[PDB]
A paper describes a structure:
Photosystem II ([name]) of cryptophyte algae associates with alloxanthin chlorophyll a/c-binding proteins (ACPs) to act as the peripheral light-harvesting system, whose supramolecular organization is unknown. The [name] supercomplex consists of a homodimeric reaction center core and peripheral antenna protein subunits, where the peripheral antennas absorb light energy and transfer them to the [name] core to initiate charge separation in the primary electron donor P680, a special pair of chlorophylls (Chls). In this work, we isolate the [name]-[name] supercomplex from a cryptophyte alga [name] and solve its structure using single-particle cryo-electron microscopy (cryo-EM). In addition, a special Chl a-binding antenna subunit was identified and named as cryptophyte Chl a-binding special protein ([name]) in each [name]-[name] monomer.
Targeted local refinement was conducted to increase the resolution of the cryo-EM density maps for the peripheral ACPIIs, leading to a final local resolution of 2.84 Å for the peripheral antennas of [name]-[name]. The high-quality cryo-EM density and sequence characteristics of the [name] protein isoforms allow us to model the six ACPIIs as antennas encoded by the lhcr genes rather than by the lhcz genes in the structure, and they are named as [name]/2/3/4/5/6. All [name] antenna subunits consist of three transmembrane helices (αA, αB, αC), a short amphipathic helix αE between αA and αB, and a short amphipathic helix αD at their C-terminal ends, which are similar to those of LHCs from red algae, green algae, diatoms and higher plants. However, structural comparison of the six [name] subunits reveals remarkable differences in the lengths and orientations of the N and C terminuses. [name], [name], and [name] have similar C-terminal lengths. These structural differences may be a result of the specific position that each antenna subunit occupies, thus contributing to the distinct arrangement and stable assembly of the ACPIIs in the [name]-[name] supercomplex. Each [name] subunit binds 9 to 12 Chls a, and most of the binding sites of Chl a are conserved across the six [name] subunits, with the exception of a613 and a614 specific to [name] and [name], respectively, and a606 missing in [name]/6. In addition, [name]/2/4/5/6 each also binds 1–2 Chls c, whereas [name] does not bind any Chl c and a Chl a molecule is found in the binding site corresponding to c610. In addition to the large amounts of Chls, each [name] subunit binds 3–4 Alx molecules. [name] is a distinct antenna subunit consisting of a single N-terminal transmembrane helix and an extended C-terminus, with a total molecular weight of around 24 kDa. In addition, two Chl a molecules, Chl a601 and Chl a602, are identified in [name].
Author numbering:
A (entry chain P): 47 to 219
B (entry chain s): 83 to 285
C (entry chain 9): 45 to 222
D (entry chain 8): 44 to 216
E (entry chain 0): 53 to 224
F (entry chain p): 32 to 218
G (entry chain 7): 42 to 235
Amino acid sequence: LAVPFLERPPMLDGSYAGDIGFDPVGFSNYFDLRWLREAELKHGRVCMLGVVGFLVQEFVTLPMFSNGVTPVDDFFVVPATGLWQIFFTIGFVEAFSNGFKLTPSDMFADDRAPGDLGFDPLGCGKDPAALARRQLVEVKNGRLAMIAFGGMLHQQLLTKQGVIEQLTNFKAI
Amino acid sequence: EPQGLTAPIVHFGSVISLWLLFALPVWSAAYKAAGADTAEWVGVSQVTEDAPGIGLYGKYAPEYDGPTFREGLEYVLSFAWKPPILIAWKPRADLDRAMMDPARDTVVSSLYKSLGGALDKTAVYDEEDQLLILSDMETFPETELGRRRVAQAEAAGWFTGNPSFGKSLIEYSEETKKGMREPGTVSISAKELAALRAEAAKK
Amino acid sequence: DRSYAMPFLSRPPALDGSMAGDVGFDPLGFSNYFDLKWLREAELKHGRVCMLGCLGFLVQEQANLPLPGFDNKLATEAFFSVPAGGLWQIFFSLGAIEIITNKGKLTPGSMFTGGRAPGDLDFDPLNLSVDETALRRFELAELKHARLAMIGLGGMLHQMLLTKQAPIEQLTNFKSLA
Amino acid sequence: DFSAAVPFLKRPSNLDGTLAGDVGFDPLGFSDVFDLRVLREAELKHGRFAMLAVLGFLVQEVYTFPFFPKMAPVDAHDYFVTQGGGSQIIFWISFVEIFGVVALFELIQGKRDAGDFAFDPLGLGKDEATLARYKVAEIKHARLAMIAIGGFIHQFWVTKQTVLEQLGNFQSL
Amino acid sequence: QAIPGSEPPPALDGTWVGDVGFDPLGFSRVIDMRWLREAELKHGRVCMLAATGMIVQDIALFPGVTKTFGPAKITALHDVAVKQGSMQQLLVWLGFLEIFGFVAIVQMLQGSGRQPGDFGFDPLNCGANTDTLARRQLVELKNGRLAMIATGGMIHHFFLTGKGPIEFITTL
Amino acid sequence: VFPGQFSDSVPFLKQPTNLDGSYVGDVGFDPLGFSDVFDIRVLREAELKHGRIAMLATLGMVVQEAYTFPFFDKVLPIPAHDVIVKSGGMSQILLWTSFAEIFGGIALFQTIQGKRAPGDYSFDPLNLSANDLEKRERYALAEIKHSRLAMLAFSGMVHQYFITNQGVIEQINNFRPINGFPDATFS
Amino acid sequence: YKDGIIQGLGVEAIPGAGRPANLDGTLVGDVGFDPLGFSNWLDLRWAREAEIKHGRVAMLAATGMIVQDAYKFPGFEGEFGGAAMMKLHNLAVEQGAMQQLLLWLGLLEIISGVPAIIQTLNGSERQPGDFGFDPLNCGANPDTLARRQLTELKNGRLAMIAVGGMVHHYLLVGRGPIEFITNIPNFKNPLPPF
Ligand code: CLA
Ligand code: KC2
Ligand SMILES: CC1=C(C#C/C(C)=C/C=C/C(C)=C/C=C/C=C(C)/C=C/C=C(C)/C=C/C2=C(C)CCCC2(C)C)C(C)(C)C[C@H](O)C1
Ligand SMILES: CC1=CCCC(C)(C)[C@H]1/C=C/C(C)=C/C=C/C(C)=C/C=C/C=C(C)/C=C/C=C(C)/C=C/C1=C(C)CCCC1(C)C
């Protein structure tokens, strides 16, 4: 149990990966656990790619754009047009992968697995035991990556330095 | 230097606000658990029951069923426009000139009787209309000389032509509604009279 | 049958002695022409306001909030020194309190129709007055303090209006009238 | 049945003799017309005012408060009209007699004896015989003082000197 | 039986220390007996300590206290010590003790079982046995009344003459 | 002195109604009857929280005067409060303690439901008194005693600084009476 | 004494005439003398009370006329001088003696005579002229009381006539009663200021 001085949440049976009965604020109750699991997986995946993006943008810059001082400021040096292209591409991807159901009500109409958008092009998730292990690994890495992203974004905003650049040039504020 | 939500002042204000917001339910629940409802948490006072001012019941709340608020305001106004002040210096009741021995009269008593005092014998009323105009009209009998004078005048043309000459408006209204047509005249419809006049002037 | 407070006056018909604080002192006979529940409610409200007012009169001259315009010791002048916007905010907050604590029943013809003791606004955070005898003693004490505080607030306000001096300070610096 | 006091006048019909000081004296016969209880209330109030006034004249002539200025009792009346003490005195008299009006109304209704405010704080009169004797003494003193206070005031008006001062040098004019 | 002409109130019916039937005004008719006896013992003990302290102060002072308080005694001593902070300390700590005194009075009035003036302060087990305890109760009450009157006397003597107890009684 | 049942600590006061004696540190001392108005569980949780905070506070009030970190600056703790408020670190202490108290509030609300012991956060990483039960109540008594002592001691150190304007280590080595009373006249 | 030969039906003044019907010889001093018919339209109680009061006031007045002309109280003779009779009234009005006498006698009359008047007119047992003023128990015997009543009535008539005489003597000559009787000739008269 994650919080020993509190009871186990009623809705956390342990079916999902990474469930250690951690929900003191009780979002498991009064909400849809499938919705929360899909939200957690999407946040984890987005931050998981964002951390790699923050790492890459320091040393690798696409020839079309001009690199900013920080990957946070790389958002501003790129034109506003092209940014909305990314926004609309993400909208299309989130519409087609979700089957054009985009609300807490109509989603999970077929009761698919939360976070299962049917994207396994390399076919890695075949063995069910390995599938469960990879589910645990993915959820734990997403939980780590969301904290890591929320940290490195603010470090870059405050120090105006890259993350590896900050680690090699650590200084007080 | 920081201002607004980033300021530490707003930070400790927020933590105090959260302290109060959580102080409502935690101490409400701690109260509901204890409540001081055990049969020893009673108030104490040095005053015994025999002291004046102590009521018989705790919260009485009597049923009123009395005069309205407007009547109470009128009573408060009557405090001003009719206080029971000059009613004190009013003549006694049970005073009459039947038990009051005249052989005991004094200056004030005699002056009070002379000024219409102790007038309990005034139950009599005048019992006179004092606005009654007499209406006992007398009809003079008609003589034979006069019955011969209404004749020889009705034949001569009098009594006809002006039926409302010597009669008042009320007097002429009393007739022409209960009878008494104009003498020497008959009743005929307008169409019949027109036809008769047309036949009279025929050819 | 004579009233205890006025031994020469007859006891008022509505003041039988069941209600707290009753010594038969209604010479003008207000209880004969007004709802005694309304009269007791008004008496208690006036007395509570005056108890808090006397406390404020004694406190403001010794302690004040560290705010601009909030440093006036003379409370009568402090009413005009404090910004009027805050005073009207106090007025509307107390009006909301009046609305809530009376359940929207404000008129004499509706305040006690739902059933409520006079002065019972459901305020006893210490759960006192569960004992009936203790409740009676506390009611007598509350009424006596209410009347004493009405008289005291009137006196202190008039002395502050006349002598232009705050209380206690006036006691220590007693200046007789010219 | 002639009057005990006036041998040549009939005893007034409303003066049975039960009241204190009822000796049968009423030549003009005000008791024949106006209520006897109200008349006794007025008599007692007048007499009490007059007794207090006579005692006050004596004391003021013999001793004045050091914080008050020194002058004769009669001409101090205008001094306290201007100063405001007299306004206070009549204010408190009016306050007492606001309830005095209610007492008079109850006397009219017959629920109170005349002049009986039940004011016996020291418990001097409790025995009925002593109470009657005290009533007779009170009414006699009330009448005597009612005469005496007017005597004091008019003697001051004509001689321009106070009571004991006039008793000092008896100037006749 | 104190005053032969009058009679004691019904609350004064024996079974109390010092009950000689002396209560002509009738305080026990409107005031609870336990509160009255608690107040009597508190006044008596306070005035006992006050009188003994006044005697000791007028006899011998503490080292170094005259350098600060000067030649001030009784009321002048109080007026100086309130500025000194000694009387502030006494007020704070004695009121802190009187908080527990207050809840003791409350529990007595609501029926805990304690008697008026009983704070359980009996070091060395002095006077805790047999009729000696009752005799000590009577002695304490009478000496408290005596000390009350003596304290009033000393205070008014300093008001009138401006001299301490031991020097007023020797310089008439 | 008179016969009757009373509290063990105060001999003239009865044993409080809700202080049965199951909780550690209970010597029957509740004169004003706070346990009669509010639940004993919530009061014990409040007491333990105050006491632990005051333990850490006294240790800090000693150490900061004894030794200050290479960063920050050499300054007395009471003005160090304002210094760190301006520096921004105290806001972060507030944020993190608030994050802990978010779960602390849910713990308190489950204590009202009677699912956890008051003040029991099950935090014994060194298992000093976890496996043994007899040592647990002894350590609970020691903890509550030190909690009360620490609250008193921190209040004392703060109010000694407020009038002496000296550190705690400074005052126990350079003890000076307040207000210049050694040579004060007409005070 | 009430004998029937000094008053009543027996003796009858202006003899050879008839007594008035109302004058039935019952009251004191009835000698049947009432010309001009005053006893027919006037109440005998009111008339007898008026006669008694006039007689008593005239007795007092005549005694005052006699005494003031012989002896004067100390203090008054310095304020008024030698004035007497009809001058003493005008000086006493300004001095204040007459005003005080008027006030006190008027108060006495208001609180004694008028209530007595109305009681005895309306039929009380109080005889006219009777105030019950009998200190020293004079005339306790009924026969002596009737003698005293007749004597008082006759002396009151005498006093009224004598007072009128003295007033006119002063208005003509200008002297007081004993001075007028010791100065019988009408010559050497002083000024009689009214
Ligand atoms: C226009 C409206 C109005 C009406 C209809 C009345 C009607 C009445 N008023 Mg009133 N009043 C009014 C306006 C009005 N008032 C105003 C505007 C005032 C001034 C604020 C007053 C002040 C007033 C007083 C102070 C009193 C009344 C009283 C009365 C009642 C007298 C009847 C009674 O008891 O017989 C008896 C009435 C008598 C007058 C008999 C007394 C006779 C004595 C011997 C007279 C002696 C003289 C005395 C000094 C007063 C005369 C003053 C004169 C010399 C100037 C009567 C119901 C009296 C009362 O008893 O109310 C219940 C009373 O005491 N009124
Ligand atoms: C989410 C991924 C994504 C998709 C799926 C997507 C699809 C297409 C297609 C359809 C097949 C075409 C034909 C097309 C063409 C152009 N793209 Mg897109 N594009 C994406 C990303 C970006 C970004 C990040 C930027 C960008 C831009 C341009 C410009 C330059 C215009 C110019 O030089 O002004 C042209 C001509 C840049 C921009 O618009 O601003 C300069 C720029 O910043 N694009 N793009
Ligand atoms: C106006 C004014 C003021 C004033 C004033 C005041 C208060 C003036 C008060 C005047 C008063 C009270 C006069 C009273 C006179 C009483 C008399 C004459 C009683 C006589 C009784 C007799 C004769 C009894 C006779 C008798 C009778 C019937 C019964 C028995 C037989 C006999 C004994 C003979 C001031 C001072 C405030 C100043 C202001 O600026 C102006
Ligand atoms: C619960 C738990 C488990 C065990 C550890 C521990 C005991 C510490 C305990 C506590 C964990 C804690 C405190 C976790 C804290 C997580 C936090 C503070 C996460 C915050 C993340 C913040 C994020 C992403 C911000 C994202 C902002 C983004 C993208 C966009 C930025 C911007 C760009 C450049 C484009 C334009 C708009 C804008 C805003 C200028």
